Each structure stands twice: as C-alpha cells, then as structure tokens.
Scaffold this active site. Structure first.
Site, PDB file in Angstrom:
ATOM      1  N   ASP A  69       0.843  -1.205   0.000  1.00 24.17           N
ATOM      2  CA  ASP A  69       0.000   0.000   0.000  1.00 24.17           C
ATOM      3  C   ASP A  69       0.880   1.258   0.000  1.00 24.17           C
ATOM      4  O   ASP A  69       0.694   2.178   0.802  1.00 24.17           O
ATOM      5  CB  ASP A  69      -0.950  -0.005   1.207  1.00 24.17           C
ATOM      6  CG  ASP A  69      -2.039   1.066   1.108  1.00 24.17           C
ATOM      7  OD1 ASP A  69      -2.442   1.504  -0.010  1.00 24.17           O
ATOM      8  OD2 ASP A  69      -2.514   1.470   2.171  1.00 24.17           O
ATOM      9  N   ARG A  94       0.305   8.975   1.410  1.00 23.42           N
ATOM     10  CA  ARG A  94      -0.228   8.989   2.798  1.00 23.42           C
ATOM     11  C   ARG A  94       0.607   8.085   3.712  1.00 23.42           C
ATOM     12  O   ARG A  94       0.538   8.258   4.894  1.00 23.42           O
ATOM     13  CB  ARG A  94      -1.689   8.548   2.845  1.00 23.42           C
ATOM     14  CG  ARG A  94      -2.672   9.664   2.553  1.00 23.42           C
ATOM     15  CD  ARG A  94      -3.945   9.422   3.325  1.00 23.42           C
ATOM     16  NE  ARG A  94      -4.493  10.695   3.702  1.00 23.42           N
ATOM     17  CZ  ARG A  94      -4.203  11.337   4.810  1.00 23.42           C
ATOM     18  NH1 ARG A  94      -3.811  10.689   5.885  1.00 23.42           N
ATOM     19  NH2 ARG A  94      -4.339  12.636   4.835  1.00 23.42           N
ATOM     20  N   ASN A  95       1.339   7.142   3.144  1.00 16.84           N
ATOM     21  CA  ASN A  95       2.168   6.223   3.903  1.00 16.84           C
ATOM     22  C   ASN A  95       3.641   6.589   3.829  1.00 16.84           C
ATOM     23  O   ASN A  95       4.509   5.745   4.055  1.00 16.84           O
ATOM     24  CB  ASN A  95       1.929   4.774   3.421  1.00 16.84           C
ATOM     25  CG  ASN A  95       0.631   4.195   3.972  1.00 16.84           C
ATOM     26  OD1 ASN A  95       0.257   4.493   5.094  1.00 16.84           O
ATOM     27  ND2 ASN A  95      -0.028   3.339   3.208  1.00 16.84           N
ATOM     28  N   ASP A 123       4.304   2.027   7.739  1.00 14.93           N
ATOM     29  CA  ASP A 123       3.332   0.955   7.579  1.00 14.93           C
ATOM     30  C   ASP A 123       3.820  -0.143   6.649  1.00 14.93           C
ATOM     31  O   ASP A 123       3.009  -0.801   6.025  1.00 14.93           O
ATOM     32  CB  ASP A 123       1.984   1.523   7.078  1.00 14.93           C
ATOM     33  CG  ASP A 123       1.227   2.238   8.189  1.00 14.93           C
ATOM     34  OD1 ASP A 123       1.588   2.010   9.349  1.00 14.93           O
ATOM     35  OD2 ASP A 123       0.269   2.988   7.927  1.00 14.93           O
TER      36      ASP A 123
HETATM   37  C1  LIG Z   1       4.659   0.380  14.996  1.00 12.14           C
HETATM   38  C2  LIG Z   1       4.228   1.673  14.328  1.00 12.14           C
HETATM   39  C3  LIG Z   1       4.210   2.868  14.929  1.00 12.14           C
HETATM   40  C4  LIG Z   1       3.770   3.740  13.992  1.00 12.14           C
HETATM   41  C5  LIG Z   1       3.565   5.072  14.073  1.00 12.14           C
HETATM   42  C6  LIG Z   1       3.106   5.794  12.983  1.00 12.14           C
HETATM   43  O1  LIG Z   1       2.863   7.156  13.066  1.00 12.14           O
HETATM   44  C7  LIG Z   1       3.854   8.096  13.031  1.00 12.14           C
HETATM   45  C8  LIG Z   1       5.187   7.740  13.141  1.00 12.14           C
HETATM   46  C9  LIG Z   1       6.127   8.740  13.126  1.00 12.14           C
HETATM   47  N1  LIG Z   1       5.688  10.050  13.029  1.00 12.14           N
HETATM   48  C10 LIG Z   1       4.405  10.370  12.885  1.00 12.14           C
HETATM   49  N2  LIG Z   1       4.122  11.689  12.764  1.00 12.14           N
HETATM   50  C11 LIG Z   1       2.887  12.207  12.527  1.00 12.14           C
HETATM   51  C12 LIG Z   1       2.782  13.576  12.690  1.00 12.14           C
HETATM   52  C13 LIG Z   1       1.581  14.252  12.489  1.00 12.14           C
HETATM   53  C14 LIG Z   1       0.457  13.537  12.105  1.00 12.14           C
HETATM   54  C15 LIG Z   1       0.524  12.155  11.913  1.00 12.14           C
HETATM   55  C16 LIG Z   1      -0.633  11.445  11.548  1.00 12.14           C
HETATM   56  S1  LIG Z   1      -1.235  11.786   9.817  1.00 12.14           S
HETATM   57  O2  LIG Z   1      -2.388  10.812   9.542  1.00 12.14           O
HETATM   58  O3  LIG Z   1      -0.066  11.552   8.872  1.00 12.14           O
HETATM   59  N3  LIG Z   1      -1.776  13.404   9.628  1.00 12.14           N
HETATM   60  C17 LIG Z   1      -2.559  13.888  10.772  1.00 12.14           C
HETATM   61  C18 LIG Z   1      -3.983  14.360  10.423  1.00 12.14           C
HETATM   62  N4  LIG Z   1      -4.327  14.292   8.989  1.00 12.14           N
HETATM   63  C19 LIG Z   1      -5.200  13.122   8.802  1.00 12.14           C
HETATM   64  C20 LIG Z   1      -5.124  15.499   8.701  1.00 12.14           C
HETATM   65  C21 LIG Z   1       1.742  11.500  12.130  1.00 12.14           C
HETATM   66  N5  LIG Z   1       3.501   9.388  12.916  1.00 12.14           N
HETATM   67  C22 LIG Z   1       2.829   5.078  11.799  1.00 12.14           C
HETATM   68  C23 LIG Z   1       3.068   3.692  11.765  1.00 12.14           C
HETATM   69  C24 LIG Z   1       3.520   3.057  12.852  1.00 12.14           C
HETATM   70  N6  LIG Z   1       3.804   1.767  13.061  1.00 12.14           N
END
Ligand SMILES: Cc1cc2cc(Oc3ccnc(Nc4cccc(CS(=O)(=O)NCCN(C)C)c4)n3)ccc2[nH]1
Length: 306
Positions: free
Chosen positions: A164, A168-169, A182
């Site tokens: 995937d 977004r990933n 992911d």
């Molecule tokens: C074991 C495992 C842990 C893990 C953690 C993960 O997430 C992580 C890992 C490292 N850094 C970030 N930074 C980050 C900073 C701001 C927002 C987001 C969530 S987002 O969906 O990309 N955007 C936020 C709101 N959008 C929908 C409007 C992530 N996230 C993603 C995959 C992961 N797998």
C-alpha cells in the site's frame, strides 16, 4: 497483568516511566499513535530526551489486533534500519498495554505536507492549509521521490513487499527526510472490500497494480506500480489519483490501457518514468534499484532555483 505472553526483548524494552506521553498524532481503527518524550532512550545518554511516536491498541482491541501489533514490531526488527523508513526505537511490553516506539516524523504524511506547500496559480489545485509553508524547489520534489525509492529499494532487498505504498504512507521528519511507514503491517487473511475508505478517506484500490486489483497478486513489481502512482502524487503536490473516475470502473480502464495523464508541472522524463512503473506486464516495469539510479541522476540535473 495481561492474559497474553507479550515478548520481552532486553535489547528493545524501555521502562514505561521513561516515556512522557504527549499529544495524539493519529488514530485509526487499529488503535492510536501518540507523540512522546523518551528519557534515556540511548543507554549511553541516560539524561537526554528524545521525541518519539508511540503506537498502542484501542481499548476495544481484540486478540488478533494484539497479534497484529506484535507482528509489526517483530517484522521491523527483522527488516533492520534504513534512513528512509520509519525505524523501531523500543517497546514497552511489561507493566501495562503494549507500546511500540518508533522514530517521530514531525511534519506528518507526504500528501498533506505537499498540499500545504502548494503555490497559487494554474499548475496545482488550491492550497488547503491555513498555515501554508514555503513551496518546494523542482530539485526538492525529485529528491522526495529519490528518497522514497531508496527506502523501497532497501525494503525490497529485505524481501518486504509494502502492498500500500502511497503518499499517505510516507512521513516527513523535521529535517524533511522522507520515511516510509506501515511497511511492517500484517496482510489481512480475508478478502478485502475495494470500496471501503481508510479512516482518512483514501481508497487504496487506486494504488493497486492491475494484477493486485484483479487477482490479489502482490510482488515487488506491484509496489513499483504504486511508486508510479506516488510519483504522480508528488508532482501534483498531493493530488488525488484518477480524478473523476469511479472506482468500480478502474480495472476495466486500466485493462484497456488507461493511464493518468501527465501532471501540468512534470518533465517528460519523469512522466515516462511513471508510465514505465505502470507497464501492464509486471516483469517489464523497472526495479527499485533502477529507479534509484535514474532518480539519483535526475536529482543532480534538476534545478533548485525554482
Ligand atoms: C509500529 C508503528 C508505529 C507507527 C507510528 C506511525 O505514526 C507516526 C510515526 C512517526 N511520526 C508520525 N508523525 C505524525 C505527525 C503528524 C500527524 C501524523 C498522523 S497523519 O495521519 O499523517 N496526519 C494527521 C492528520 N491528517 C489526517 C489530517 C503522524 N507518525 C505510523 C506507523 C507506525 N507503526
């Protein structure tokens, strides 16, 4: 105390009182990711704080969910570290719910990062950010693509098929390093719903190679197809693939040879690289090794003056 036998690994285990939990980063149907400060994450630097992302299960979580999260953690250990992937940093398996601790990417996912850096005018859709940031250079964009290719080349070399790969990933760090996320997720054992949106509104069907779409065959070649879609996302600065195309139509179209048209701001060379990734025949697509070599050359030739 958990009813389950959570796998304690002394190399990775962190006492959970070394974690100062902070704000939510994102939530899915899996559980949630929060930002945290880790104290003495590096054993030789016990007095230092490191910002990290912590994944944990929702309260509604089943035994398969737990098994899935353990699986992601262990797969990451086996795949090992690379600059252009989200790396494992530790885990809390004892004295509370499972926490998996990974590198923190402060600037969030690549699609939203690029959208907030959209300049005004004809080549891109509007900038939806109320805190827009400085636009990237042409070289910056090719360098995003190159870094993702380098991360996938590493993952492929460790026999990891992402399945995937999408903007977004891809997450972006404070220093603007691209990191694939992911990549360690368990593959569902049931058939999938092609019309079900992610928690963030995306339809993963639009990144699937035709053989994945049609016959659920996923290989490194089908990840290269997705990388072609990701390329298109980069040069639209976070655009949404196959605009105006209903999903139930997509396979027919692809099978007939339909492909996305070139983004308005995109060189012939980079559009041909997209098209090559979208070769109908999986064996005829470039490999990530090849993509990395070509993107390396293209980065060096691409202007950072505009
Ligand atoms: C074991 C495992 C842990 C893990 C953690 C993960 O997430 C992580 C890992 C490292 N850094 C970030 N930074 C980050 C900073 C701001 C927002 C987001 C969530 S987002 O969906 O990309 N955007 C936020 C709101 N959008 C929908 C409007 C992530 N996230 C993603 C995959 C992961 N797998």
């Amino acid at each position: 105390v958990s009813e389950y036998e959570l796998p304690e690994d002394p190399r990775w285990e962190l006492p959970r009182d070394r974690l100062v939990l902070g704000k939510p980063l994102g939530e899915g149907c899996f559980g949630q990711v929060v930002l945290a400060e880790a104290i003495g994450l590096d054993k030789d630097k016990p007095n230092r704080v490191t910002k990290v992302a912590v994944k944990m299960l929702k309260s509604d979580a089943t035994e398969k969910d737990l098994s899935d999260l353990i699986s992601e953690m262990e797969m990451m250990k086996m795949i090992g570290k690379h600059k252009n992937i989200i790396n494992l940093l530790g885990a809390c398996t004892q004295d509370g719910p499972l926490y998996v601790i990974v590198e923190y990417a402060s600037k969030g996912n690549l699609r939203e990062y690029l959208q907030a850096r959209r300049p005004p005018g004809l080549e891109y859709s509007y900038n939806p950010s109320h805190n827009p940031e400085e636009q990237l250079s042409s070289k910056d964009l090719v360098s995003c693509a190159y870094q993702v290719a380098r991360g996938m080349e590493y993952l492929a070399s460790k026999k990891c098929i992402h399945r995937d790969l999408a903007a977004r990933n891809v997450l972006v760090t404070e220093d603007n390093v691209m990191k694939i996320a992911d990549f360690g997720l368990a593959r569902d054992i049931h058939h999938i719903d092609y019309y079900k949106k992610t928690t963030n509104g995306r339809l993963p069907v639009k990144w699937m190679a035709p053989e994945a779409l049609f016959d659920r065959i996923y290989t490194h070649q089908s990840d290269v197809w997705s990388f072609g879609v990701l390329l298109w996302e980069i040069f639209t600065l976070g655009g949404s693939p196959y605009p105006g195309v209903p999903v139930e139509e997509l396979f027919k179209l692809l099978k007939e040879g339909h492909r996305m048209d070139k983004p308005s701001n995109c060189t012939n060379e980079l559009y041909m690289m997209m098209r090559d990734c979208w070769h109908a025949v999986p064996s005829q697509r470039p490999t990530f090794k090849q993509l990395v070599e070509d993107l390396d050359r293209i980065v060096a030739l691409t202007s950072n003056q505009e």
